[PDB]
């Protein structure tokens, strides 16, 4: 019962699967795709003190994983290393197939202690955690992720405009924090510039400010003292310096996507795994900014789809799901030509000559 969308001349409409429309021309399995749009483009606050409030701890629910193919560039990503007060771990170790999220601008690395009243860390809002083409419902220890949603979609087959061409490397900086009482309402954060020098962290501080507050302190912050660790407090009198319709507070008109390279695109003698690019050289970047009505249509559709996807994941017993699109292709083909479809009848929309 997962909704899917159909693009018609750069106009998106949720597929009328109930109305059972056959205007959509599906020819091959290359025309089905899934996209991992992230929550940051919806206008949510992304700073560490407010982003942590959306994740909670629960025991008694197994985790699930979903495959997604294409994605979007993330401005801010997170990396947790939370530990129990007595030295026990809180976050599970990442399985073998899990890898960090590609194309992160800033990586907010958080370390410290806090009570852990559950086995796994879930999202309170119901969204996903994305780890390099593998969306998951829980947080793994030490792996970079970005919170977002996934949408299923049917493309045109004209020229592979989407996720194969540009309608028209990268640097990631790590920011290190120290947290105490993680997971509760009494949590406290400190921004770390070195061992024995921290700055008390507020909500209004943007990553550009933190990197500047870094640079000023190294310049004349008297780090070359043996007194011990000190806490810097910023002065409090200075500022920090069916056709779907969108209902989000803000939608980002542009889309900066990455995707796995086309099989036929590569021609050089790099197909050999020995003489091949590493795990970070696979991806292909692009930029789809020609239209904004379609892009904000995508963001709303993925905002709706997660309602049905979470219920489908709960029923199944498979650890990792890769067969959602194949089931749709089989289901679509069993409904149209399933049996005894009349020539004149509109259900089996064939034409006489």
């Amino acid at each position, epitope marked *: 019962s997962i909704p899917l969308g159909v693009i018609h001349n750069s106009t998106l409409q949720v597929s009328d699967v109930d109305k059972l429309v056959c205007r959509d021309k599906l020819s091959s399995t290359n025309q089905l795709r899934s996209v991992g749009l992230n929550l940051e483009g919806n206008g949510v606050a992304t700073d560490v003190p407010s982003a942590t409030k959306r994740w909670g701890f629960r025991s008694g629910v197994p985790p699930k994983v979903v495959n997604y193919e294409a994605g979007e560039w993330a401005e801010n990503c997170y990396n947790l290393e939370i530990k129990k007060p007595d030295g026990s771990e809180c976050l599970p170790a990442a399985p073998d197939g899990i890898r960090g999220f590609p194309r992160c601008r800033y990586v907010h690395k958080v370390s410290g202690t806090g009570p852990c009243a559950g086995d796994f860390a879930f999202h309170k809002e119901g969204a996903f955690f994305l780890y390099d083409r593998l969306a998951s419902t829980v947080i793994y220890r030490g792996t970079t992720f970005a919170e977002g949603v996934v949408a299923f979609l049917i493309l045109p087959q004209a020229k592979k405009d989407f996720f194969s061409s540009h309608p028209l490397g990268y640097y990631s900086t790590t920011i290190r924090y120290q947290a105490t009482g993680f997971g509760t309402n009494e949590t406290e954060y400190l921004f770390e510039v070195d061992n024995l020098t921290y*700055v008390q962290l507020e909500s209004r501080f943007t990553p550009q400010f933190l990197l500047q507050l870094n640079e*000023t302190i190294y310049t004349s*912050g008297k780090r070359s003292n043996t007194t011990g660790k*000190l806490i*810097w*407090k910023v*002065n409090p009198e200075i500022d920090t310096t069916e056709a779907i319709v969108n209902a989000q507070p803000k939608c980002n008109p542009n889309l900066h996507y990455w995707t796995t390279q086309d099989e036929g695109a590569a021609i050089g003698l790099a197909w050999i795994p020995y003489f091949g690019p590493a795990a970070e050289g696979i991806y292909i970047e692009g930029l789809m900014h020609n239209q904004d009505g379609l892009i904000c249509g995508l963001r709303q559709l993925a905002n709706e789809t997660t309602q049905a996807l979470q219920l489908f994941l709960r029923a199944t017993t498979e650890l990792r799901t890769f067969s959602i699109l194949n089931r749709k292709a089989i289901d679509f083909l069993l409904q149209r030509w399933g049996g005894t479809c009349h020539i004149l009848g509109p259900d089996c929309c064939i034409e006489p000559h």
Partner: nanobody, 122 residues
Framework: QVQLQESGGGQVQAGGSLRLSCAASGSTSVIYAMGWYRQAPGKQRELVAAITRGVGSTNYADSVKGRFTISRDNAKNTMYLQMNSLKPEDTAVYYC???????????????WGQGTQVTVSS
């Protein structure tokens, strides 16, 4: 840390020009707005001039707009008030503050020099 020091004041005739200087060493990175305040005997302290560290914006009082200029050299850790067209009402002690942003665990903020007397003779 941002130990301030005023200089350049003294006795001077009305209608002339004078340059006041305020210097600082120690940190001088953390400073955010060097300024200029004045106190006549028996009077409260009132604003004269203000400049941001990045020369982002300059602000002057209405009684002093058009006659005073505030500038800085950046790579001297110094700040100047070059002024013109004195009047006897400016006879007072001139101070420079160095209100910074971060400050260590003493958390003092709003550093303040000892001040220098400017006397206008007419």
């Amino acid at each position: 840390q941002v130990q301030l020091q005023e200089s350049g004041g003294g006795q001077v005739q009305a209608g002339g020009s004078l340059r006041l200087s305020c210097a600082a060493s120690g940190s001088t990175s953390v400073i955010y707005a060097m300024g200029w305040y004045r106190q006549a005997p028996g009077k409260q302290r009132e604003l004269v001039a203000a400049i941001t560290r990045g020369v982002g914006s300059t602000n002057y009082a209405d009684s002093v707009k058009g006659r005073f200029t505030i500038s800085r050299d950046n790579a001297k850790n110094t700040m100047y008030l070059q002024m013109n067209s004195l009047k006897p009402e400016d006879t007072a002690v001139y101070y420079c503050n160095a209100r910074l942003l971060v400050a260590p665990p003493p958390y003092e903020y709003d550093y303040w020099g000892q001040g220098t007397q400017v006397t206008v003779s007419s």
